[PDB]
Nucleic acid binder design. Structure first.
Ligand SMILES: [Cl-]
Ligand SMILES: [Cl-]
Lengths: 105, 97, 83, 93, 97, 78, 103, 95
DNA sequence: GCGGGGGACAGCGCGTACGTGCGTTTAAGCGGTGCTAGAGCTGTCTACGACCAATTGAGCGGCCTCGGCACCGGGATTCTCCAGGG
DNA sequence: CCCTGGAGAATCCCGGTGCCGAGGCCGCTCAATTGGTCGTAGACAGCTCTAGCACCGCTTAAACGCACGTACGCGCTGTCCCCCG
């Protein structure tokens, strides 16, 4: 294979992640494993998220992942939710949670 | 006739607005507001319609986050009704000014 | 044409709707003005910054991106509009 | 003009993971944001590590430890393994 | 004689806000630090400045925290801080969940 | 060890904190709190040391950690 | 030098080095090490100002960390700037909540 | 015995410029040096993104300037831009 | 650890503000048309920055003496809590 | 027993003193400055083509304003024990 992506057996474009790291003034020089590693970690996470979004889409009987589905995904996962603990998703909405003391007895 | 008891429609409305994602502030008022404030910083500014929409997305998120924490403060005080002083405690603690 | 008092566009039923998605059931009457107060300090912050980007980009039009960069700056990162 | 995007790679991975499932324009956009955010966050913190250690170059050792600061546990651990795997895979091939 | 309950409290507040000296004695703290780090890596050494740095950062943080805790106590028409305050403080800070 | 963080020490911090009256359960709560704090800071710190290939955690690792965590500290080589 | 040529006390050279080496951009203008060294100089003055004041107020010829803290937390604009900074040996401002005071 | 740099001496000179008959402790000197480096990063950093954001390769006094306007509170910014624009023009005088 | 004081907390009751509903009123949202400002893309010339080398003192560590101030044992001032009176 | 005015603690204020880190100078060196070449990032003038603003009216969903009473904010009390001295 020609694509460095394939050499790494990755979906993400390792050539892109390589250009970016240079046109980005993070350091003089960039290693060759760093793009690879990063391009992969990017993939793990988009996968990790898309997984939970799809499930969210499924319960809501839907073919197509819309941001509510990403939002539900993110704030239901303790850990993803913390990675994006200071982030807003356009059209997210919030998690259904109503405080106890506001419920009738 | 018929009359839902106090607090009954509140609970309903909460559930309504917690299922959806559509913006709660009306679109036009919102824009007029943003154009004002921005004018008073620099005159003769235009906006990408998506740039307003960004600021609103960002605005509502904040306020809903805010009410969330306000609400906690009401409840902290063995109360169920939110009050300016509640908001005020949330912002002091958030470390806003 | 001149623009005046627009914060009162932020009607009471809306400042209500937000509070509901916020999990609030009972709203004190002195809340609606404090919220407008807050929303203003909020918009004045994002737009002071949005604008500073717009001025630096030497532009007369404020872009979705200037907004998004501002939010990121103020630690209120936003997905959905570029960036 | 050319507006680059991770729209294809995100599709690819979605198809790998939920093959009867499509993404909306907005959703894509969001996804597309998330990749960029985590890119900078990682890349930046790696850059600090080079600097802190009087070092002129960001190697995957950096990108790794960057990851160990940025991500929460289970996420971090998996991501690390996932990452150092494709490097190993990459060297050999 | 006897000073009325709470009056040395006020006097002590005055004394500590006037001073900048550290309030946890170094060695227990130091031993706490080494313990916690051992759980992350074995056979480790600390620079004495590295321990001070931690100490300053931690105390300063806790004081700040009591400040905000204390406001919650007060928000609840109380005068005694209680764990339920800290939890609210931190919650709103977004430290705890 | 943790209980080495004495009641009186915790009392002083709350005094400098502006606090007049302290419940009994606070003291222990404070401890979990302080623990969580150091952990996170020392986890990040050590990670810097592990990456610097050193058996000696420096002040700068600490300082870098506090920055990471948005609790910047001055006076140890900013 | 250039500190001279710009009336600055702050090392205009040092600064130009640091910008180039600290990986902020490919190239680095001539004005910027000067503009910045100045802003750095400006702000260190405002602090040294109000701290010194504070050391006078607290009756000492030498500035200790506290005097910095007092200068900083009492200044509304500086305090914001250093909103997320703990200053070693700063202590706190004296502030006791009303309802805590005796009747 | 390694030659570690700082801003110490310049902090002092400026101290004299404002409070001629006043001195400083080492402990506070560190704080002044920390303060300087922190502020230097924050401004430099902002400037850096500014360039990127605008698809441009150079950090000029202008970039620094607007960086300052994002980083600083209304009044402190105001003076800063002064001293900034001043020392620059005064610099471009001499050669 | 001891001893007792006042603060937490629970119960109750009053007073009223805020939720609800309806009729009235206002302006948001829609899509449809028209106008040009300004962004974004383009194309040439050159100024300003990086980069290399060679010379020069600004800045650092190492040095000692000296005084601002941290220490102490004596006296000066402002709070508070006990006891006396009704 | 409650309320008033009194009493004595606790901490500023001082004068002697005393010691160690400030702040200063000694001299070396390495980072800065100088003089200089080369090319390219970006300034700037030209040009087109998007989308931002403006303006209107048919439609109506939302907002406003008022009426009513219910159930919650809070003020009071009263007890028991958990903190302060
Ligand atoms: Cl590498
Ligand atoms: Cl420049």
């Amino acid at each position: 294979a020609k694509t460095r992506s394939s050499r790494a057996g990755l979906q993400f474009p390792v050539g892109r992640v390589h250009r970016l790291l240079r046109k980005g003034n993070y350091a003089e020089r960039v290693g060759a494993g760093a793009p690879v590693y990063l391009a992969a970690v990017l993939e793990y996470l988009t996968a990790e998220i898309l997984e939970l979004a799809g499930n969210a889409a499924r319960d809501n009987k839907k073919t197509r992942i819309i941001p509510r589905h990403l939002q539900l995904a993110v704030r239901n996962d303790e850990e993803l939710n913390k990675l994006l603990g200071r982030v807003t998703i356009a059209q997210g909405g919030v998690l259904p949670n109503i405080q106890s003391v506001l419920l009738p007895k | 006739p018929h009359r839902y008891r106090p607090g009954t429609v509140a609970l309903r409305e909460i559930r309504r607005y917690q299922k959806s994602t559509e913006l709660l502030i009306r679109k036009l008022p919102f824009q007029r507001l943003v154009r004002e404030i921005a004018q008073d910083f620099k005159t003769d500014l235009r906006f990408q319609s998506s740039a307003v929409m960004a600021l609103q997305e960002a605005s509502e998120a904040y306020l809903v986050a805010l009410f969330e924490d306000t609400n906690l403060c009401a409840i902290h005080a063995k109360r169920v009704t939110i009050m300016p002083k509640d908001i005020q405690l949330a912002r002091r603690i958030r470390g806003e000014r | 044409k001149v623009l005046r008092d627009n914060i009162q566009g932020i009607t009471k039923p809306a400042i209500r709707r937000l509070a509901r998605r916020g999990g609030v059931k009972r709203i004190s009457g002195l809340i609606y003005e404090e919220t407008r107060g807050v929303l203003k300090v909020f918009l004045e912050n994002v737009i002071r910054d949005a604008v500073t980007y717009t001025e630096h980009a030497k532009r007369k039009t404020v872009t979705a991106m200037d907004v998004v960069y501002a939010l990121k700056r103020q630690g209120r990162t936003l997905y959905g509009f570029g960036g | 003009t050319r507006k680059e995007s991770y729209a294809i790679y995100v599709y690819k991975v979605l198809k790998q993971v939920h093959p009867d499932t499509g993404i909306s324009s907005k959703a894509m956009s969001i996804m597309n944001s998330f990749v960029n955010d985590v890119f900078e966050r990682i890349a930046g913190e790696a850059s600090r590590l080079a600097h802190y250690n009087k070092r002129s170059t960001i190697t995957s050792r950096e990108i790794q430890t960057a990851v160990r600061l940025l991500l929460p546990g289970e996420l971090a651990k998996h991501a690390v393994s996932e990452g150092t795997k494709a490097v190993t895979k990459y060297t050999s091939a």
